[PDB]
Design a protein around this ligand. Sequence first.
Ligand code: HEM
Ligand SMILES: OC[C@H]1O[C@H](O[C@H]2[C@H](O)[C@@H](O)[C@H](OCCCCCC3CCCCC3)O[C@@H]2CO)[C@H](O)[C@@H](O)[C@@H]1O
Length: 462
Amino acid sequence: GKLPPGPRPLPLLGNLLQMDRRGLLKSFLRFREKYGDVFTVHLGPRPVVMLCGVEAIREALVDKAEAFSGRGKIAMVDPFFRGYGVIFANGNRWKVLRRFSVTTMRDFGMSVEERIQEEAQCLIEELRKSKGALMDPTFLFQSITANIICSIVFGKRFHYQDQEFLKMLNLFYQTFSLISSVFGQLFELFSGFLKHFPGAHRQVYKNLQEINAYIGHSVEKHRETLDPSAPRDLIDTYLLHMEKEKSNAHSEFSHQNLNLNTLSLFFAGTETTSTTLRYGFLLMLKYPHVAERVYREIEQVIGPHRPPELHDRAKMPYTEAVIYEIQRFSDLLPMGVPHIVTQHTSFRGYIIPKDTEVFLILSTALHDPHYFEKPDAFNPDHFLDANGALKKTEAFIPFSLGKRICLGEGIARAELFLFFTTILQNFSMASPVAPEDIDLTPQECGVGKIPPTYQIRFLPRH
Ligand code: HEM
Ligand SMILES: OC[C@H]1O[C@H](O[C@H]2[C@H](O)[C@@H](O)[C@H](OCCCCCC3CCCCC3)O[C@@H]2CO)[C@H](O)[C@@H](O)[C@@H]1O
């Protein structure tokens, strides 16, 4: 008849002494063994409600969408955002910024396909330049996803050796890792205390600021050469809305929202898609039978000549199930992004007060044994029926659900399929490390799950 059951906390340190050393997710998976799918965990001084498994996640985010559609904070970035931009906004602010984003993301968007195709070719082009040398694919996979989002937002794409562009992508990488670091998870619990001392949070804050100053300077240029009848990109469109509303008593179209909303899209748009790729090719190195089986489907469906295209999808159910599996296994946001309830809410006989944070442990759905047979292993069959046809599932929710559902899943999936197939079409992969010696153990597991560094060669097939 009250907030969900869970480990009895202490004053000051909530459930610190019951956490697991390996981090927040490990801790939660245990607490689940004992407490069930719905439970409270005091992270520092606050009863954060965890929801696990597809039933429960779906029941909150969908059936109770209103109650569960609010946004929590990520302690490590909150000092910078403080509720601005679409990702971290609530109430009307979010409403406006979500609508704005979704509409202008499509407008130049869902041509988007043409831009991914073009970028995919600049990409092949660069991988030829490497001449099969060993390389860390990190910056490139970042470049390509970033360029898609940049073209939509700044109206252009960046050269792969643009120093100032590489500087931006370095900041995203570091930042996401600092966030996901163990000090990151620790900061989630004790930022009240830890904020007053040195540590990664200050690096993150500084980084976000740098990125934001670039965005801000770019906004200034857009303003100087703005043509009210020929809006170039998302920033221009924003600037016009800003003008339209400048007499409205409260516009959410403020400079803070412009800069941070842009940053949110720019960053979000870059990080996960590229990471999925990174973790995807490490999986190809570890399982070449899957890689060449994907090639043999590229063979039949596209041949080795024609740029692949979104239409090819339906005809390539294996490649598609391979991608779904890469996503599932990668599990890139094991805990999604934090929610809050917007009212005093009933859930399974429990009561969650207004404004009680809620974590939807997406990872528990992507690993649910009722839906996947060896949840811990990389196996495309998980997305295939007996006939080798595509088998989508209720539990594949790496984008979350509901009103906060990833507003980029559409473009993320285009990018994923396009970039993936266009690479495999042209290249084969090898590394020094023998397949079964390849370690899939992530180098960070916090807010994000981050794959180890690896070296890779792309050998031509001509
Ligand atoms: C496979 C890659 C991606 C994954 C797995 C992913 C996943 C997610 C998740 C888990 C959330 C919030 C979850 C929740 O609170 O329920 C989210 C929201 C969001 N994503 Fe992504 N995302 C991906 C790619 C992208 C891309 C390409 C963009 C392009 C802009 C993007 C932009 C955003 C934004 C702006 C939000 C905020 C949604 C809101 O607050 O209404 N993401 N995504
Ligand atoms: O020139 C900058 C340098 O100044 C910095 O130190 C600050 C740290 O950054 C700063 O974090 C530390 O602050 C002392 C924290 C004391 C707050 C006590 C809190 C306890 C919890 C309850 C609220 C209060 O002061 C340090 C020394 O003044 C540090 O000397 C160097 O860290 C840094 O070289």
